[PDB]
C-alpha cells in the first residue's frame, strides 16, 4: 500500500514517506519535488473524530487513524501537482507544468467499437500480469512488519490489477483476535456507511491512473456496465468482453476468454484469520461466476430495473443516521443496495449495487474477493455514475455526510483506507467533470 521507496526499515523508523522526485544532488535532495517547487514533505492530517461504537473494540487495528500506524509525514503537493512524490498531475490536468486541462469520458462498455472493446480486455489482462511500478503490499500486520529478525520488511511486489484487489481486501478484512481474545466486532472501511461511494470512487480513479500509466495512453478511461436492465442474463458475459460461461464447468469462464486464465488473490480467509497474516501476491484458483445461478434466493436472479436507478436519485439526503446498512431515506444506503430504491430500509431488500454483485453467484459476490472478477470494475463505474449524477442534481450537499460517529473508516475527513498518499472522503465528494477530469456518457431514466 506504500511506495516501494518507503517499505524499508529506515523509512518506517523515520515515520516519513517522502520519496525523491529527481535526486540529482544525491539521495534525499529532491523529496516531493521540493527542489522544483512541486511539493513538500509535511505532517499527515488524519481524522481524530470519534466513530460509532463497537463491542468489543481494542483499538489496536492498524487501520485506525490511517496512515498513522506507519507514517506521519507524506508529500503535500503544490498547485495541480500530485503523486506520492508530486511527480504527476492532479486528475483533470496534464503537462510538466500540470496546466493543460484534460477531460476523459467513461462510456457504456456495450457502446464501444469492436476495436476499443479488444483494447479494454487486453489492457485489463495486461494490468493483471504487470508489476505495479510503485506500490508494494504488506503481507504481515504492523507488529510483525519487519520480520522475524526485525530487519526484513514483509512487503511483496504485486501486479497492477492485483493491487486493485488487495486494497479492497484490506479495507474489509476482520480485525485480528489472536489467542484467548474474544470475537471482536466486525468492521468495514469501505461499505455499510457513507464512505462506500467515495472509497470506491477513488478506487476506480487509482486503477484508471495506473492503467493510463501502464499503457502510456493518458486518455484511457474505464467503461461501465449498465446493470439496471431487469435482465436475467449478464449482457457483457461474452467471449469478446468479460467472458461467457464455460461449456465444461458452468461456474467457470469460457476458455475462449483471457479471464478464464486469471487466478485470484486473497482467498485464504482461514489462513489469515488464524495465522495472523495478510493477503499476499500469490494467486490460487480461478474466477467463479454463475449469473442468475443463485437458485436458493430467487430475489438474487434478476438485475435491478431501470426505474430503480431513477427512483433512488429521488432520495435527497446523502446519508442518514446511524450511517449504516440499516439507514432509511439515505441515498447512500439505497444505491449501495441495503434499502429499497425508494429509500425504505428492509433487512430483506437487496437492490442496485448489492443486487448486481449477488446476481453473479460467484467470486464477484464474496466481499473479500469480489474485485478479482473484472466485472467489478464496470459494476462500480456504473455505481459511480449514479453517485456523480446525484452530486450534480443536489449541488454536492455534503452536509448529511457525518463528521463523527459514523462507522470506523466513514467519518467525512477519514483518510480512505489503505490509499496512498492519504486522501479523505471529502476530496472525492465533488462533481467529476469539473473537479476530477472525467465524465460519464450516460442517459438517465426519465419517469
Ligand atoms: C512521527 O514519527 C516519528 C517516527 O516514529 C516512527 O514512525 C511512527 C509513524 C510510528 O510508527 C512510530 O512508532 C515509529 O517509531 C516519531 O519519532 C519517534 O517517536 C518515538 C516515540 O516517542 C521515539 O521513541 C521513543 O524514544 C524515547 C527517547 O529516546 C531515547 O533514546 C535512547 C534509546 O533507548 C534511550 O537510551 C534514551 O533514554 C533516550 O531518551 C524512549 O524513551 C521511548 O521508549 C519508551 O517508549 C516506548 C514506546 O514509545 C516503549 O516501547 C519503551 O519501552 C519506553 O517506555 C521511545 O522509544 C523515537 O525515538 C522517535 N524517532 C525518531 C527518529 O525521532 C515522531 O515523534 C512522530 N511525530 C509525531 C508528531 O507524532
Ligand atoms: C451460488 O448460489 C448457490 C445456489 O443458489 C449457493 O449454494 C447454496 O447455498 C445455500 C445457502 O447457503 C445452501 O444451503 C445450499 O446447500 C447451496 N446449494 C448448492 C446447490 O450448493 C452458493 O453459495 C452461491 N455461491 C456464491 C458464491 O454466491
Ligand atoms: C442499525 O444497527 C445498529 C448497529 O447494530 C443498531 O444499533 C444497536 O442499537 C441497540 C438498541 O438501540 C443497542 O443496544 C446496540 O448496542 C446497538 N449496536 C451497536 C453496534 O451500537 C441499530 O438498532 C440499528 N438501527 C436501526 C435504525 O434499526
Ligand atoms: C520490484 O520491481 C522493480 C522494478 O519493477 C525491481 O527493480 C525490484 O528488484 C523488484 N523488487 C523485488 C523485491 O523483487
Ligand atoms: N454483501 C452484500 C453485497 C456485496 C457488497 C460488496 C461486495 O464487494 C460484495 C457483495 O456481495 C449483501 O449480501 O447484501
Ligand atoms: Zn477505535
Ligand atoms: Zn504543502
Ligand atoms: Zn466494494
Ligand atoms: Zn461493490
- Class of secondary structure makeup: alpha+beta
Q: Might you state the CATH topology name?
A: di-copper center containing domain from catechol oxidase
The helix content is 10-25%
Radius of gyration: 21 Å
The number of helical segments is: 11
Which geometry do the CA atoms define?
Answer: globular
CATH architecture: Orthogonal Bundle
Which strand-content bin applies to the residues? 5-15%
Family: Belongs to the tyrosinase family.
Binding site for Zn(2+) A: 168, 191, 200
Disulfide bonds: 6-17, 18-41, 32-75, 77-86, 89-98, 234-237, 266-279
Membrane topology: Single-pass type I membrane protein
What does it look like?
This protein has 447 residues and is of the alpha+beta class. The protein has a single domain (2-441), classed as Orthogonal Bundle (di-copper center containing domain from catechol oxidase). 25% of the residues lie in helices and 8% in strands. The protein has helices spanning 9-14, 114-129, 160-172, 195-215, 269-275, 306-312, 331-336, 352-359, 375-393, 425-428, 432-435, and strands spanning 2-3, 39-43, 73-77, 81-82, 88-89, 93-94, 100-101, 104-107, 135-138, 155-156, 438-441. It has a three-stranded antiparallel beta sheet with strand order 1-9-10, with no helix packed on it. A two-stranded antiparallel ribbon has the order 2-3. It has a two-stranded antiparallel ribbon with strand order 4-5. The longest helix is centred in the middle third of the chain and has 21 residues, at 195-215. The chain is globular, with a radius of gyration of 21 Å. 2-acetamido-2-deoxy-beta-D-glucopyranose binds at residues 131, 133, 157. The site of a molecule of 2 linked components (NAG-NAG) has 8 residues, from loops. Glycans are attached at residues 72, 80, 157, 280, 326, 361. This is 5,6-dihydroxyindole-2-carboxylic acid oxidase. It is a single-pass type I membrane protein. Its EC number is 1.14.18.-. GO terms for molecular function: metal ion binding; oxidoreductase activity; protein homodimerization activity; tyrosinase activity. It is classed as metal binding protein.
Amino acid at each position: 500500500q506504500f511506495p516501494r521507496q518507503c517499505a524499508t526499515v529506515e523509512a518506517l523508523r523515520s515515520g516519513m514517506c517522502c520519496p525523491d522526485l529527481s535526486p540529482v544532488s544525491g539521495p534525499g535532495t529532491d523529496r516531493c519535488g521540493s527542489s522544483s517547487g512541486r511539493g513538500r514533505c509535511e505532517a499527515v492530517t488524519a481524522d481524530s473524530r470519534p466513530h460509532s461504537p463497537q463491542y468489543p473494540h481494542d483499538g489496536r487495528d492498524d487501520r485506525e487513524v490511517w496512515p498513522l500506524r506507519f507514517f506521519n509525514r507524506t508529500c503535500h503537493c503544490n498547485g495541480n501537482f500530485s503523486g506520492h512524490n508530486c511527480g504527476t498531475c492532479r486528475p483533470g490536468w496534464r503537462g510538466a507544468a500540470c496546466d493543460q486541462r484534460v477531460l476523459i469520458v467513461r462510456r457504456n462498455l456495450l457502446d464501444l467499437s469492436k476495436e476499443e472493446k479488444n483494447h479494454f480486455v487486453r489492457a485489463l489482462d495486461m494490468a493483471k500480469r504487470t508489476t505495479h511500478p510503485l506500490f508494494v503490499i504488506a503481507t504481515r500486520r504492523s507488529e510483525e512488519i519487519l520480520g522475524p529478525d526485525g530487519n526484513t520488511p514483509q512487503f511483496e511486489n504485486i501486479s497492477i490489477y492485483n493491487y486493485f484487489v488487495w486494497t479492497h481486501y484490506y479495507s474489509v478484512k476482520k480485525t485480528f483476535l489472536g489467542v484467548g481474545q474474544e470475537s471482536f466486532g466486525e468492521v468495514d472501511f469501505s461499505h455499510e456507511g457513507p464512505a462506500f461511494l467515495t472509497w470506491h470512487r477513488y478506487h476506480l480513479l487509482r486503477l484508471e491512473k495506473d492503467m493510463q500509466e501502464m499503457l502510456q495512453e493518458p486518455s484511457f478511461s474505464l467503461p461501465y456496465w449498465n446493470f439496471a436492465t431487469g435482465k436475467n442474463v449478464c449482457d457483457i458475459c461474452t467471449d469478446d468482453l468479460m467472458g461467457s460461461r464455460s461449456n465444461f464447468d458452468s461456474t467457470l469462464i469460457s476458455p475462449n476468454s483471457v479471464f478464464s486464465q486469471w487466478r485470484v488473490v486473497c482467498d485464504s480467509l482461514e489462513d489469515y484469520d488464524t495465522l495472523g497474516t495478510l493477503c499476499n501476491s500469490t494467486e490460487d484458483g480461478p474466477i467463479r461466476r454463475n449469473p442468475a445461478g443463485n437458485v436458493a434466493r430467487p430475489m438474487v436472479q434478476r438485475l435491478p430495473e431501470p426505474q430503480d436507478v431513477a427512483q433512488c436519485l429521488e432520495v435527497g439526503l446523502f446519508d442518514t443516521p446511524p450511517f449504516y446498512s440499516n439507514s432509511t431515506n439515505s441515498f447512500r444506503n439505497t444505491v449501495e443496495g441495503y434499502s429499497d430504491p425508494t429509500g425504505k430500509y428492509d433487512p430483506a431488500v437487496r437492490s442496485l449495487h448489492n443486487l448486481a454483485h449477488l446476481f453473479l453467484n460467484g467470486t464477484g459476490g464474496q466481499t473479500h474477493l469480489s474485485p478479482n472478477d473484472p466485472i467489478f470494475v464496470l459494476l462500480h463505474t456504473f455505481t459511480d455514475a449514479v453517485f456523480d449524477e446525484w452530486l450534480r442534481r443536489y449541488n454536492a450537499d455534503i452536509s448529511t455526510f457525518p463528521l463523527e460517529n459514523a462507522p470506523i473508516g466513514h467519518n467525512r475527513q477519514y483518510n480512505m483506507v489503505p490509499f496512498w498518499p492519504p486522501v479523505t472522503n471529502t476530496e472525492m465528494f465533488v462533481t467529476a467533470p469539473d473537479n476530477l477530469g472525467y465524465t460519464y456518457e450516460i442517459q438517465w431514466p426519465s419517469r
